[PDB]
Amino acid sequence: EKELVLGIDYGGKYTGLAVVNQKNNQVLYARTVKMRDDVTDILAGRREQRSLRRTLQTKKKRLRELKNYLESIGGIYEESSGTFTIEPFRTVYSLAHKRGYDYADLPRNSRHRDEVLRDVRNVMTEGNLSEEQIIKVESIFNKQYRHKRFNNRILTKCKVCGKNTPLRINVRELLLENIVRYLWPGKNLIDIARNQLRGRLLFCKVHFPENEKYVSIEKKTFRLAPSLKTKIENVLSVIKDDILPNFTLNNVVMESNNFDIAAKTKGKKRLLKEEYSKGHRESGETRKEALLRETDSRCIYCGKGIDLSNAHEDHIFPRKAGGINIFGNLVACCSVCNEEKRGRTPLESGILPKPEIVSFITNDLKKKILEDAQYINTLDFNKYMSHASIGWRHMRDRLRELTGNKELLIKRQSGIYTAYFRKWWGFIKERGNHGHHALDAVILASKKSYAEDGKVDMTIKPCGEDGKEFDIERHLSEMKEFRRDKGGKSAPLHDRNPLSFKNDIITRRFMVTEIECGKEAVIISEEYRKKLTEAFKRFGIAKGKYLTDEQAKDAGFYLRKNGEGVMSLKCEVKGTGYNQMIRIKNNIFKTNVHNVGVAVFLDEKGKKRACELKNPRLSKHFVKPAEQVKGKVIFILKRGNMVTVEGEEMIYRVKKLGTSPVIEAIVGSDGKTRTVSATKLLKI
RNA sequence: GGUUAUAACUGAUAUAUGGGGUUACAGUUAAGGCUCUUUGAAAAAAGAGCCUUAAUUGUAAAACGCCUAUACGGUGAGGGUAUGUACGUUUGGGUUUGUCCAGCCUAAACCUCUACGCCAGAAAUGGCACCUUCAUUGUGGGUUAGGACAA
């Protein structure tokens, strides 16, 4: 064990860690891990909820300020009605809720701020009011309560010292002198002058000019995405428990992910070198400008005129299920086509692109996605290619900190090299079971010596327990699972969609197109439910599909806005109990953190009894009363607690609380869960 | 090979909004039911009341809590505004708990680093905004749907 080498295979969702010794190429430890993949969705979803909450708070402040001013100038406000009785004041208050957008100048639910202001001004003028009041009202509409601060944010530290890195927009003079030091390299200097310069220097103002010949340190990485950061931490967690206390580390290698994102994103393998400089976007333009040029500044879906003030970059492939922000996934949507699509497949949406602009597109990738949105699934580009490539740094530094040896050697191995040895030593790369990642890790750590006559040497084969080569299904341990725990204080208290609880039944309103096929029995209406079933049978729609906009209109499901929009139906919500219902203010939500543990106590008679402990943060918000603890509690059960049955010696892990906890064996059981009452269960 | 620079390419974190949708309440309309009164031999019809299901209008709520009233806004009158001020520096605080952190927000004291936006002239910079003082009049403000460890 003189030389120990650890091989790490970094992947988008699975990472394989293996450590072997180069003395005889013997496998000492090999295990693949599974990283959390819901962090990106959770972080994105949290931001939307936070933005919506802050947006509503600003609306309340704007409405309160407008109401106070309206009352001052002669308005009468009634608390019961909540709005002014006078028509000029009532209209202004009503228009304040939807003030429109003002991020672009003027060249429909959301039309513009100017149109709303013009509508506001017209109703104020008709009310015989002074221009001073109109100006003040307009100022309230355009008033900003929370100022935007995007300048001076996320300051970069210098490579040598800790001083703040100056912004590149005040460095344009310095960057010009960096090229004139030496000596087609003629258009390079033009770029710094006449375009945006986003990105810090990674250096301060005293080392960048003259001390640029400081090539002694690695590229420091200070900022990492939380989803990518927790993926590395989960991998490092496995290393600390097993690799750290068992064996020492002398060398570490990693699989370099040269996915060629600039090449696989266009539906090709590797385009020309000269075509890498010029991307899909037009020269001297943005994504919106480039999208309009390919559509001739019109709309693909409806053909109406599109300007920069209303152009939307739609995702032909919805982001609700999949969705990738590529140039070939966004074409055009002006005001209503985006609203009608609302994040669903165009084939399922039914708003087919007009066959007059598709033939005018010069991009071959756009042809396939528009004809069939499902083609992106068969594309050779995935979001995990960037996930695997991004994050190779900030891992060696953390590895060096954990295991010491700040002078650790870092090497990168390409996937082509490990493929040669895998197919030559007698290994098969199966796209099925995930145990094949530990083997990539072993080939990553294995000594590479061809010798012989140009063929891979057979005496350097990795060894199993004693000499039995390396078997994925025989010489591997259990692959670790990293999941999300909802028992913490950071988990959501309830669902984001309020529910209606009238006459002791949980119901909610759902769109006709949003109703899944085969689940129409929940509709309370005895006439629209039959109509929905008839439409499904007539059009020949299987289970799991929806109704398109054209099909819904032709089936009489469009009597919402003068025959120009789909309606909504009130249907009962399945898979919900009374204990999950919590009422906050006038809203009612369904919760999932209502159970925090199982408490077992002694009854008055003497027999043991089990109850469910409720969340302290939601105890007073429960619609129905719960059951408390009467006798003395002997023990309290919790999630992730190793328990055993009264008539068995196996170890089980509790997954669900309640009077009948659900338990599952740590090793084995083929993933099947076991349900048993807590009375006949004991905690180990 | 490393570092850095210029293009481009995806990946994912904050920020500030524009909508759709959901729920509560209060009106209106349509259709379908249940009762009462009444026209009526009867058939039947009308009026009134209630319910259900759709369409429509307005208003309101959207995590619990914790912290802050020594706080947080409106109006009017002064001053300060690259010599300045914080999105910056230094030491802290709130969220914040069994413990620690992220992300936001913020106090006192300071310009070494970092950043400093809009609307208007014919060189003279004016308004807005920001900061601050005072008076008057209100009850507001921040954070919270993420990650670890421990019980």
Add this chain to the structure above:
DNA sequence: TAGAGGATCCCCCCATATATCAGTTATAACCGAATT
């Protein structure tokens, strides 16, 4: 008539600006250490 086993049920969407970093591809500049 009570509790497990076994079906199937349940979760919010679109977009517009404003900033930033972290990876890849290409070209160019050097720096540097190994290799020849």
Add this chain to the structure above:
DNA sequence: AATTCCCATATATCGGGATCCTCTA
């Protein structure tokens, strides 16, 4: 003092409950 830069198409692809119907002592 001139040259190499590890050998040498591949790598990446809910959880925590709930009801309903069916068995079992």
